[PDB]
Amino acid sequence: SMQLNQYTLKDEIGKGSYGVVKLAYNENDNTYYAMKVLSKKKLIRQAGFPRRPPPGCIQPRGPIEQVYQEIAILKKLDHPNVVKLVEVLDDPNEDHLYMVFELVNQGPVMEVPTLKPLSEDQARFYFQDLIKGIEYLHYQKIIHRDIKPSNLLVGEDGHIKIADFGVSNEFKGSDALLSNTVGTPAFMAPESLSETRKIFSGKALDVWAMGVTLYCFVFGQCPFMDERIMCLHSKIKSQALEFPDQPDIAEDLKDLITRMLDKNPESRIVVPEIKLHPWVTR
Numbered sequence: 001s002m003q004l005n006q007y008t009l010k011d012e013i014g015k016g017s018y019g020v021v022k023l024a025y026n027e028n029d030n031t032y033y034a035m036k037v038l039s040k041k042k043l044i045r046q047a048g049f050p051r052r053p054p055p056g057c058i059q060p061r062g063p064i065e066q067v068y069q070e071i072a073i074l075k076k077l078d079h080p081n082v083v084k085l086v087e088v089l090d091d092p093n094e095d096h097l098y099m100v101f102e103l104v105n106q107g108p109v110m111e112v113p114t115l116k117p118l119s120e121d122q123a124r125f126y127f128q129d130l131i132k133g134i135e136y137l138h139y140q141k142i143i144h145r146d147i148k149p150s151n152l153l154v155g156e157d158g159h160i161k162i163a164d165f166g167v168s169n170e171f172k173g174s175d176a177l178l179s180n181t182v183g184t185p186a187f188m189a190p191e192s193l194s195e196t197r198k199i200f201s202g203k204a205l206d207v208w209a210m211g212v213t214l215y216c217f218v219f220g221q222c223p224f225m226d227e228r229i230m231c232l233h234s235k236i237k238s239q240a241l242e243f244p245d246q247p248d249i250a251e252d253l254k255d256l257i258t259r260m261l262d263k264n265p266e267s268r269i270v271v272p273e274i275k276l277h278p279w280v281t282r
């Protein structure tokens with residue numbers, strides 16, 4: 001192990017989009033926490049080398065601003081279905097940055113693909129948690145942009161907390177107006193995967209990813225899948241949603257998933273409607 005101020009840093013417990021997460025023991029309050037460890041120089045390099053001056057896809061001028069945005073976002077959020085940032089350790093003369101979170105004991109709910117999906121009733125309990133967390137994020141003008149089962153941590157109490165705010169965005173106004181976005185390929189909405197003159201809604205991207213997540217919950221694999229990236233993108237954009245013959249799930253759950261995975265973001269179900277869907281309220 002190693003010492004960092006009042007913390008004893010132990011084994012690596014997870015690895016998200018950036019950095020690594022260690023188990024950390026706080027000697028002052030005799031409590032364990034989850035500590036995300038980052039290198040500022042590495043975060044800068046992850047964005048790519050800056051371009052020489054020339055004579056929708058422009059590199060950010062100051063890539064380090066994204067981690068400070070993630071920190072500001074996490075500081076704003078206090079909800080039982082969202083991770084809780086408790087401290088940031090950041091010396092301006094050091095390259096490392098540390099983010100301390102309350103521990104969510106059991107880790108990710110699922111790592112897709114799995115041969116062991118959840119039952120329909122357990123999927124409903126976790127999905128009810130997911131709705132509450134996302135509705136709160138959206139109310140706080142935050143889009144997560146990386147909703148998937150491996151970013152949903154199960155606590156001591158059997159409830160989920162949304163984690164990995166590495167690519168999250170805070171917007172002004174009613175919704176985020178995006179020209180392009182980031183995400184895990186199999187969870188990205190069809191509108192985000194074309195060359196077009198049309199911007200798209202950030203909140204509806206989170207809904208699409210919730211739809212893929214819910215499908216994963218009960219089936220253990222994504223609805224659109226291919227190892228070839230061009231084929232995966234083509235399927236997300238043009239392949240009709242299908243459900244496997246087994247496990248046989250309820251018709252109302254198929255209705256809900258179908259509405260969340262509507263390829264048209266204008267007609268895709270919204271979170272206020274998802275909350276009142278018959279499968280959710282049963």
Ligand SMILES: O=C(O)c1ccc(-c2coc3ncc(-c4ccccc4)cc23)cc1C1CCCC1
Binds near residue numbers: 036101102106107150
């Ligand atoms: O990469 C980040 O941005 C990030 C930041 C904080 C936590 C975290 C906070 O509280 C936690 N309690 C528990 C765990 C955990 C425990 C066991 C196994 C895996 C994760 C992770 C966290 C987790 C992450 C990601 C790394 C894999 C999951 C998502």
